[PDB]
Design a protein around this ligand. Structure first.
Ligand SMILES: C[n+]1cn([C@@H]2O[C@H](CO)[C@@H](O)[C@H]2O)c2nc(N)[nH]c(=O)c21
Ligand SMILES: C[n+]1cn([C@@H]2O[C@H](CO)[C@@H](O)[C@H]2O)c2nc(N)[nH]c(=O)c21
Ligand SMILES: [Zn+2]
Ligand SMILES: [Zn+2]
Lengths: 157, 157
C-alpha cells in the first residue's frame, strides 16, 4: 500500500506539471487506506509560493475532515518535504511520512538547496517525533525519475 | 518605520485572538513603506493549521501583487516565525524580516516547543542569508507581553 500511495503522489507530480499548475511535486494524504487528499504543487496556479504539494494536501485534508489535526492520517510525498512543508506536517500532527525522492534529486534539476534538518535528524531547535520512511527500490526509482522526465517541462520557482 | 509596522503586527495579533480567528500572532508585509498585507493567524477561522499569520500575509501579498516572489518587500512578525513560517518566508524571497517577541514568549504560555534552526543559525542543512532583525526596546517589550496579556482569551489548539 505504501507503493500504491507513493505512486499516486508521483502521478500527481506529473499531472501538475502537465497542466502548468506548478512544479513536479505531489502529495497524497490517507486515513488508513482511504485517500483523504491527493494534490500537487499549485504555486503557479494560485500565485502562492506556499502552495507546495504537501501544504496543499494538508489544507485539503483538514477541510475534508473538518479539523486542524490529522493524527490518524499518513502523508506520501513524491519528494522529500522542504523545511516549510516539513514544519506544516509537524503542525498538522500527521503520524507518518513516506517520501520518494531525496531532496538532492530536485536540486539536480534546478530547485533551491533547501533541506529540512528536522527530517534528516540534524535539527537542534526543531525535533520531529513522527515516523519517517524514505522509499527504496521501485518507489525510489519512480520518484527519482520524475525529475529527469519533467526537466524543462515547467517553469522553475 | 520598523516600530510602526511591528506595532501594526502586534495589533493584528490582539485583533485576531479577540475575534476568534486564531492565536495571538500578527504579520504585516510592506513594499517601500506601503502596507501590502496585514494579517493574523487564521488557523481556527480557516480550519487550516498552515494558516499562521506569516503564511496568511504571504498568500495575501502575493495575490495582491500578482507574483510569487516578494523580493522588494519586508515582513514584520509579532512573534519569531516558526520552522514552517520561516520556510515560507524563505520561499517567498522576502528581503527582510523584523520580529518582535522571541519564540520562548509563546512557548511560555503553552505553544509547541517548535523553533526554526535556520532563523537561529543552528542548522546543518538549512541556512539562511535573509536579513533578520530582532526588535529591541519599546516595541519588543510590547510584543513580548502579547502572550501573557491574551493567555485567557483563547484556548491552545
Ligand atoms: C514547490 N516545491 C518546491 N520544492 C523544492 O524542492 C527542493 C527540495 O525539497 C527545495 O528547493 C524545495 O523548495 C518542493 N519540494 C517538495 N517536497 N514539494 C513541493 O511542492 C516543492
Ligand atoms: C498558530 N501559530 C502557532 N505558532 C507557534 O509558535 C511557536 C514558535 O514561534 C510554535 O509553538 C508554533 O506552534 C505560531 N507562531 C507564529 N510566529 N505565528 C503563528 O501564526 C503561530
Ligand atoms: Zn515544500
Ligand atoms: Zn508559523
Amino acid at each position: 500500500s505504501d507503493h500504491k500511495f507513493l505512486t499516486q503522489a508521483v502521478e500527481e507530480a506529473y499531472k501538475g506539471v502537465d497542466c502548468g499548475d506548478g512544479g513536479p511535486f505531489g502529495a497524497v494524504i490517507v486515513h488508513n487506506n482511504e485517500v483523504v487528499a491527493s494534490c500537487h504543487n499549485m504555486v503557479l496556479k494560485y500565485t502562492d509560493p506556499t502552495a507546495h504539494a504537501e501544504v496543499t494536501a494538508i489544507r485539503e485534508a483538514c477541510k475534508k475532515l473538518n479539523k486542524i489535526e490529522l493524527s490518524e492520517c499518513e502523508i506520501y510525498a513524491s519528494c522529500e518535504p522542504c523545511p516549510m512543508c516539513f514544519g506544516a506536517i509537524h503542525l498538522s500532527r500527521l503520524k507518518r511520512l513516506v517520501y520518494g525522492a531525496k531532496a538532492e534529486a530536485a536540486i539536480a534539476i534546478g530547485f533551491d538547496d533547501f533541506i529540512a534538518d528536522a527530517l534528516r535528524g540534524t535539527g537542534v531547535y526543531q525535533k520531529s517525533s513522527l515516523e519517517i520512511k524514505k522509499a527504496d527500490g521501485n518507489g525510489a526509482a519512480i520518484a527519482e525519475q520524475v525529475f529527469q522526465n519533467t526537466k524543462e517541462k515547467f517553469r522553475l520557482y
